[PDB]
Design a protein around this ligand. Structure first.
Ligand SMILES: [Zn+2]
Lengths: 244, 213, 266, 298, 291, 157, 222
């Protein structure tokens, strides 16, 4: 048996990080060419996410076909071995998961015009291999990368972030322990703007905190967005070098 | 459960010479049916096979027929649902060679096999393998009774957990099921099941002749 | 899975059913296609593997452990099979699940002694399979991944005494230290029957025209159960002569150690 | 089944919103008055917002807690839709986009937020626990289902009383309402849900860069206004000066400033609603007994 | 590696001109006409995809690094029927949508001699049936970009006497002709969509270099030698090898690779990675010192 | 293993075994190894530059006196580092105004005390918080560092 | 027999009502004729979608029986051949049981029949005739036949009955007995004495019902 705190007077957290550090970010494009039109493998901390974009293609049922826009579908597979303690049941039908899937759809319905691929279907399959806090933000980044890899038109990037709050000051990018310890805010940010695609608060949060917490998240998300551009451009430079 | 009546969910369940009987065409709900009862020693098995078809599938462009087999637990809840699906997949791998599929284009044949009972006696100081040849016997009878064209009579036998199905008078094999048991029983099991096949075959042919008469 | 015209299938049959059998690719009746295997990438789990085929087929296996009372928990090794975008219930899923659990039974093809901790407690092993993509019967693909995963699995080490009958100490494990899971995972080979020829590692197009197929397990340098004949397709399934069955078992019996040798590299 | 709306309606309502006008003659920050009616039994509450009619029923029964939580009772919220609220809804459709959202908003507002003291639902630890159930019935629809439901669930829970219990180990005699009075369920806070609908002007001319058309945002939209909105926002606030939960999935992208303004506007509404809800709880509590003072001990 | 080649790796899930980035601005000249891959707001023109900026005349567009193949009018494509409905087939090509065919866009057996029949629209499955492969030309384009196909030629029609394989459409470009004759008495059909058909050389191909009732028969040539079959397998593997190295497939490249692959005795040796990489590398270097 | 990051920061895996209600759960939390952990001594020159102010403005004072209690050689001037056991027993003596003036309490110690006895942990924290011109209390986050972090050797309790 | 009902209370439905007997309060809604699902389609007649929701908890097999009996009453009432290949959704939301639902469903069924009929009337759907339903019970000692029994009376009952008759000619001629659901055991003399007194109070109810219908609806008409 043990006990632990949140934020020490020395400005140190349970894992050793300070109040404003992003975890290790690794990004990966075109990971499954023979399985999808677009694919991305995300590593944000201990989080490991495979994202597959299949489409635009013919619908399997003509009943479900829109002549004005493409049909966008997202299925999140949170594996039974994503956490330390293996879950006995499947999480697929869980109301918490249905809300997550619904949330993500609502977010990107306004971010892709989805008016230039009529009579087609875009299927997005996601596999969460490992989970360690901020899984929603990582899900957002995985879809954005995979969609771009598929050459599917969109207006801008959508970057996802996780916020942790203790006392006066929130902690950027929370892990499971911190998530357990304190309420968190998940932010969907469009491009380099201040506009949120997704605002998600599931636990109690003082009303004074949010304005400042939002400010920290937006600044951090911009850094994340910059990294993503670097991640793809860098890969392109590396790929070109490999070709040479 | 809002579909059935499962009762109180806070409760708990209870915690504690080959002979054949063949009957076909006793169900007016389907196109063909069969009853198979076998008693050996202290172990006996009674199962019912129901066949529905061939019925046309709308929009189907298949140039041949489509067989679907499902095993059910009639009374005793013993066999796992996962294992029932496995045997079903094994059974369909057999009759897809037996059934003349070229005769039923744009059509499908559904096969329901109800395992109403099996009785097992074990002494104290696989399992479903023994039922497999009886399932094949039942289906082959139910299909032949229904009017479905069969290239040959499908039959099988169980020897030390090794099940192997034969057609064309034991000259060829339409299915092979081996679980556990012992090694080097290849030649022996093939000869013992071939005798069970020929025995099950003649009784199956006689069955149709009797009821048909 | 693959859709082919009547003309293409007949040509494939001619190519493969020929007495000097030729793969459309050009392989020999015992040659496997190149695969890639990654291991130990899931730190959250006790063991993990990822296998990639040449046709893009991909499978991910995870190994997790749990202390259980072996007096009440009969099965000490549970295999779970899944596919994203695919319903769990499907005939193929449950069949492979049932099959794999028999392949890796506690007292059949696995040394369950290495899972025992004390008189009363043992390690339950959860083998979770995730098939991302597959174009044929993935039974052999999964088997290779499970093998690789179980050969790179590390379990916690016990500290307390191993006699719960008398002293009855609560199972405690020393921090940091772990013991590698020494075990002999079985392999599952799948064969294709085209006419009178038998092919190892059937391709997608090959399986479509095959007359039948075989699923043969392999453990401790010998053929073992489960052994299952299987219809790779459902339009061209035919009965086979017994000598073919004996040919298949013989074929695996001589080419399996070569596969294991290429697979046993740490 | 897809509802049919005339192109003329879509142009009329949109143009009216640019002229700060709406069909039901309301304001943009105005919320339709909420009427709360209590039935004879405790936990029976009827919420009405204009034409929108919802009914909630609170019930409980003796049950056993989960292994993971031996000190906590059980609490579930049901919001199954039916064709009674309109033929647009499929019977039992509990996986549709709007349905799952609504289900998740209520859950995060009441369940997850810990509005109900589940610890006080425990009779004997790890053995017997009360199982409170909130059943929401969507009688008819004129929009604002989420707002109606949150009011309905909370008013019901605060209304609700559970039979008094005497516990001595594993044996408990549940006193009937005849024998002794029932006991009210514990509440930690009173969450209120506000729904915001966003629109686009579609107008050629804007008078100034400094002052602009910006974005259309109204509160508690009707059925006709709900079909034409380009964005959906639901913020839950209480009288404790804190955000219970806020859910924005996609829709029309908005600034962090705009969300705050909606959040601050919603706070003035949830204050009036909470006090009003308490008042109708006070009026109904004193209502029940014609002779209660004659009744009293203390 | 006598039986199986298993590459292993531990501790890892996997192994390994202006710059363009998302939210990037390409130009601020309002005179430009914005094309594909871009979007604009007043004077500013932004990129919508990850790729290279393209300037043709006054038309600014950004060419993506990846994406679906696009049907241009007049392309020679090879497709497999997906569905039969009404008086048309929908044929898989490999694009966003299935190919469109009109009963009036195909040629009946016996041709000119043949008289129009209203039973053809009810018996389309006797001509094209699901799964069948065929040559076709993109006749026209629909509003969304979908293609309407036609086979009104002897050059086009149902495919047989061979085997199918596919490469990314980016590796096959438009040309004067996509049907080519190769050593070994085999003929390749390089569809622009990436769908490739390798068959035994017929009389038609021979005539070009210099029965109308059976143009839809599933039956193959009853006499196809093993030497042709083993040639097809070899041509298939080298094409996959060129595709593996991102090398653009051309008739010259294929024959060159086919003869260069003769170094390896067994054809199955061409499926290994190091063999594929070297074969493609040898072709590029050969074109280097020959160019 | 141990990974090196861009900031000169490192990261490893903390694995512990938890027993609850006869159950066995493996719990792991990532463990970051820092390089900017202050000694919190007045005498130190090196540490002060490294330390970073909070976004809300603040300046951090150094607690540990540059001239501590001097004792007969070869001790001389000295700082006192405590063990886990002497703290559990010794808390009253640790609050005595006539001894223990400059004390360094390691993070690992502070953590163990918190788990073993919360009230003692509060008393230990309070003394550091209530630094007066009489007694000085200091806490060092060793675990958040790399210079001092040690890992379990094979066959070591 | 002092029932109280309201008509046309719901906005987004073709027809609705709220029937109340004693405690038992049921609200009903009816939409139709409308486009039916393929599995619902009847080539020549109207398809009925009948749904019953309980006052507490979710719909179980119990309500599935309430739906079935309610179907037996409403089916011959509606002139279904007027609406071929068409659908009529009928939803009943029981708001208050007015009885121990763990033991009885008598009053809820009768109230659902009366409410459904009223909702069909409001919706303007072709009906062949009129209809009324009452719950009846028999006492353990007294063996008296009590029409419209209370919850307390049901507890001490030997048999419970649901009677729904089909009326024509200004509510004077019993066309048929749509539903009689008797649970318990019976004596012939009591049954006809029940039917004789029951018919009288039913006829009084129709007269009252006619009054209510005219009073509310007439101000709407010209
Ligand atoms: Zn220092």
């Amino acid at each position: 048996m043990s006990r632990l705190e949140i934020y020490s007077p020395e400005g140190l957290r349970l894992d050793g990080r300070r109040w404003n550090e992003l975890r290790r970010f690794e990004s990966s494009i075109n990971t499954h060419p023979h399985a999808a039109d677009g694919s991305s493998y995300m590593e944000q901390g201990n989080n490991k996410i495979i994202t597959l974009v299949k489409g635009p293609k013919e619908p399997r049922l003509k009943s479900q076909m829109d002549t004005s826009k493409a049909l966008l579908n997202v299925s999140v597979n949170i594996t039974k071995f994503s956490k330390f303690e293996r879950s006995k049941s499947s999480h697929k039908n869980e109301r918490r998961v249905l809300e997550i899937q619904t949330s993500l759809v609502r977010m990107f319905e306004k971010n892709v015009m989805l008016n230039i691929y009529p009579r087609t279907v875009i299927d997005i399959e996601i596999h969460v291999l490992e989970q360690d806090g901020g899984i929603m933000g990582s899900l957002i980044n995985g879809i954005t990368l995979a969609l771009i890899d598929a050459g599917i038109s969109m207006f801008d990037y959508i970057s996802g972030i996780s916020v942790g709050l203790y006392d006066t000051t929130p902690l950027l990018d929370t892990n499971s322990l911190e998530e357990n310890a304190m309420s968190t805010v998940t932010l969907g940010v469009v491009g380099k703007s201040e506009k949120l695609s997704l605002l998600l608060v599931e636990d109690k949060i003082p009303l004074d905190r949010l304005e400042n917490v939002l400010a920290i998240g937006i600044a951090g998300a911009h850094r994340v967005r910059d990294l993503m551009d670097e991640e793809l451009r860098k890969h392109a430079q590396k790929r070109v070098s490999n070709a040479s | 459960d809002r579909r059935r009546l499962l009762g109180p969910a806070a409760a708990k369940p209870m915690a504690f010479e080959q002979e054949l009987s063949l009957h076909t065409g006793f169900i007016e709900n389907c196109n063909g049916s069969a009853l198979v009862e076998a008693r050996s020693l202290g172990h006996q098995t009674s199962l019912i096979s129901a066949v529905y078809g061939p019925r046309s599938i709308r929009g189907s462009f298949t140039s041949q027929g489509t067989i679907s087999i499902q095993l059910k637990n009639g009374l005793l809840e013993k066999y796992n649902t996962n294992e029932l699906k496995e045997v079903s997949s094994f059974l369909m791998g057999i009759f897809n060679s037996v059934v003349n599929l070229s005769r039923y284009p744009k059509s499908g044949i559904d096969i329901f096999v109800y395992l109403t009972y099996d009785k097992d006696l074990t002494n104290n100081p696989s399992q479903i393998s023994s039922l497999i040849p009886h399932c094949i016997t039942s289906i082959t009878l139910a299909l032949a009774d229904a009017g479905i064209e069969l290239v040959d009579m499908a039959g099988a036998g169980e020897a030390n957990g090794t099940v192997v199905s034969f057609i064309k008078n034991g000259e060829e094999i339409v299915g092979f099921w081996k679980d556990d048991g012992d090694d080097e029983d290849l030649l022996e099991c093939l000869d013992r099941c071939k005798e069970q096949y020929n025995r099950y075959r003649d009784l199956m042919i006689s069955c149709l002749m009797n009821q048909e008469t | 899975h693959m859709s082919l015209s009547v003309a293409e299938k007949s040509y494939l049959y001619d190519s493969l059913a020929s007495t000097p059998s030729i793969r459309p690719d050009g392989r020999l009746p015992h040659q496997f296609r190149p695969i890639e295997i990654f291991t130990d990438f899931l730190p959250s789990s006790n063991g993990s593997s990822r296998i990639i085929a040449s046709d893009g087929s991909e499978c991910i296996v995870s190994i997790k452990s749990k202390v259980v009372d072996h007096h009440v928990e009969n099965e000490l090794l549970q295999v779970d099979v899944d596919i994203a975008g695919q319903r769990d219930d499907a005939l193929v899923v449950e069949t492979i699940t049932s099959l794999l659990n028999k392949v890796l039974k506690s007292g059949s093809g696995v040394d369950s002694s290495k899972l025992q901790l004390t008189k009363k407690y043992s390690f339950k092993i959860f083998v979770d399979v995730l098939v991302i993509s597959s174009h044929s019967h993935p039974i052999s693909l999964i088997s290779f991944a499970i093998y690789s995963a179980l050969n790179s699995t590390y379990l916690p080490k016990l500290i307390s005494a191993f006699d719960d009958l008398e002293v009855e100490e609560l199972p405690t494990f020393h921090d940091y230290d772990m013991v590698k899971l020494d075990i002999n995972p079985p392999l599952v080979f799948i064969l294709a029957v085209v006419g009178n020829n038998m092919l190892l590692d059937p391709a997608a197009n090959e399986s479509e025209v095959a007359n039948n197929g075989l699923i043969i397990s392999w453990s401790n340098g010998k053929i073992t159960s489960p052994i299952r004949s299987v219809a790779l397709n459902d339009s061209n399934v035919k009965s086979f002569k017994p000598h073919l069955l004996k040919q298949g078992l013989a074929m695996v019996e001589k080419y399996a150690p070569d596969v294991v040798r290429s697979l046993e590299n740490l | 089944k897809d509802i049919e709306i005339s192109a003329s309606e879509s142009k009329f309502i949109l143009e009216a919103l640019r002229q700060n006008y709406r069909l039901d003659g309301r304001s943009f920050d105005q919320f339709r008055d909420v009427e709360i009616t209590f039935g004879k039994e405790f936990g029976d509450v009827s919420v009405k917002m204009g034409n929108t009619k919802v009914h909630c029923r609170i019930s409980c029964q003796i049950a056993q807690p989960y292994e993971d939580r031996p000190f906590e009772g059980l609490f579930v919220i049901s919001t199954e839709i039916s064709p009674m609220a309109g033929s647009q809804f499929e019977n039992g459709n509990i996986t549709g986009e709007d349905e799952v959202l609504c289900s998740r908003i209520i859950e995060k507002s009441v369940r997850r937020s810990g509005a109900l003291d589940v610890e006080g639902l425990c009779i004997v630890a790890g053995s017997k626990c009360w199982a409170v159930r909130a059943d929401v019935h969507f009688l008819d629809c004129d929009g604002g289902f989420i707002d109606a439901s949150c009011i309905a669930v909370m008013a019901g829970l605060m209304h609700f009383k559970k039979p008094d219990i005497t516990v001595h180990g594993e044996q408990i005699i549940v006193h009937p309402v005849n024998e002794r009075e029932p006991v009210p369920l514990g509440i930690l806070h009173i969450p209120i849900c506000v729904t915001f609908s966003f629109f686009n002007p579609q107008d050629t001319e804007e008078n100034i860069k400094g002052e602009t058309n910006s974005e259309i945002s109204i509160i508690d939209a009707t059925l006709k206004e709900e079909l034409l909105r380009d964005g959906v926002l639901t913020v839950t606030l209480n009288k404790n000066r804190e955000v219970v939960q806020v859910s924005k999935a996609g829709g029309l992208p908005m600034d962090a400033l705009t969300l705050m303004k909606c959040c601050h506007e919603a706070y003035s509404i949830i204050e009036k609603i909470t006090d009003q809800i308490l008042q109708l709880l006070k009026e109904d509590s004193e209502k029940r007994n014609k002779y209660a003072a004659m009744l009293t001990s203390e | 590696s006598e039986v199986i080649t298993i590459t292993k790796r531990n501790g890892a899930f996997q192994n390994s001109s202006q710059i363009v980035t998302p939210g990037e601005l390409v130009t601020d000249d309002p005179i430009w006409m914005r094309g594909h891959g871009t979007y604009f707001l007043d004077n500013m023109t932004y990129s919508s995809v990850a790729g290279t900026v393209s300037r043709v005349n006054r038309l600014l567009s950004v060419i993506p690094l990846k994406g679906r193949y696009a049907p241009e009018t007049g392309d020679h494509v090879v497709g497999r029927i997906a569905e039969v409905g009404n008086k048309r087939w929908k044929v898989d090509i490999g694009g966003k949508q299935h190919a469109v065919l009109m009963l009036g866009s195909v040629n009946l057996p016996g041709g000119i001699l043949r008289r129009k029949s209203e039973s053809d629209e009810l018996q389309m499955r006797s001509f094209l049936k699901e799964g069948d492969l065929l040559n076709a030309e993109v006749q026209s384009l629909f509003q969304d970009g979908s293609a309407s196909l036609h086979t009104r030629s002897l050059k086009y029609g149902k495919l047989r006497n061979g085997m199918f394989c596919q490469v990314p459409s980016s590796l096959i470009v438009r040309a004067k002709n996509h049907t080519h004759n190769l050593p070994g008495n085999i003929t390749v059909v390089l569809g622009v969509n990436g769908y490739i058909w390798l068959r035994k050389t017929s009389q038609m191909d021979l005539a070009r270099d210099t029965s109308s009732w059976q143009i839809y028969s599933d039956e193959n040539d009853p006499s196809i030698s093993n030497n042709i079959r083993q040639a097809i397998c070899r041509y298939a593997n080298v094409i996959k090898a060129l595709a593996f190295c991102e090398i653009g497939i051309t008739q010259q490249r294929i024959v060159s690779a086919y003869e260069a692959s003769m170094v390896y005795s067994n054809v199955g040796e061409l499926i290994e990675k190091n063999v594929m990489e070297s074969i493609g590398s040898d072709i590029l270097t050969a074109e280097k010192m020959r160019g | 293993r141990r990974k090196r990051l861009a900031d000169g920061l490192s990261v490893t895996q903390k694995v512990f075994v938890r027993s609850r209600n006869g159950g066995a759960t493996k719990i792991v939390r990532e463990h970051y190894l820092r390089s900017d952990i202050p000694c919190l001594s007045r005498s130190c020159t090196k540490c002060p530059q490294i330390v970073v102010p909070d976004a809300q403005n603040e300046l951090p004072k150094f607690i540990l006196s540059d001239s501590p209690l001097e004792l007969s050689a070869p001790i001389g001037k000295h700082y006192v580092v405590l063990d886990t056991n002497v703290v559990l027993q010794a808390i009253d003596l640790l609050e005595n105004p006539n001894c223990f003036f400059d004390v360094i309490v390691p993070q690992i110690v502070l953590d163990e005390v918190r788990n073993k006895s919360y009230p003692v942990y509060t008393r230990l924290r309070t003394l550091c918080r209530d630094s007066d011109d009489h007694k000085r209390f200091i806490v060092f986050h060793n675990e958040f560092s790399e210079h001092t972090f040690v890992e379990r050797l094979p066959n070591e309790t | 027999m002092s029932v109280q009902a309201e008509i046309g209370i719901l906005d987004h439905v073709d027809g609705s009502s709220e029937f109340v007997s004693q405690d038992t309060k049921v609200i009903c809604s009816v939409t139709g004729p409308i486009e039916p699902k393929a599995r619902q389609e009847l080539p020549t007649q109207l398809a009925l979608e009948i749904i019953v929701r309980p006052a507490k908890g979710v719909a179980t097999t119990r309500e599935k029986v309430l739906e079935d009996k309610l179907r037996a009453v409403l089916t011959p009432l509606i002139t279904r051949h007027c609406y071929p290949r068409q659908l009529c959704q009928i939803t009943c939301q029981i708001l208050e049981s007015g009885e121990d639902e763990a033991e009885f469903s008598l009053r809820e069924l009768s109230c659902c029949i009366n409410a459904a009929f009223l909702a069909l009337v409001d919706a303007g759907i072709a009906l062949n005739s009129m209809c009324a339903s009452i719950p009846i019970a028999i006492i353990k000692d007294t063996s008296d036949i009590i029409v419209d029994p209370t919850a307390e009376q049901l507890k001490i009952s030997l048999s419970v009955h649901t009677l729904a008759l089909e009326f024509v000619n200004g509510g004077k001629v019993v066309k048929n007995v749509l539903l009689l659901d008797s649970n318990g055991d019976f004596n012939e003399d009591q049954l006809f004495s029940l039917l004789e007194l029951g018919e009288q109070k039913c006829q009084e109810l129709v007269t009252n019902i006619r009054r209510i219908i005219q009073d509310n609806i007439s101000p709407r008409l010209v």
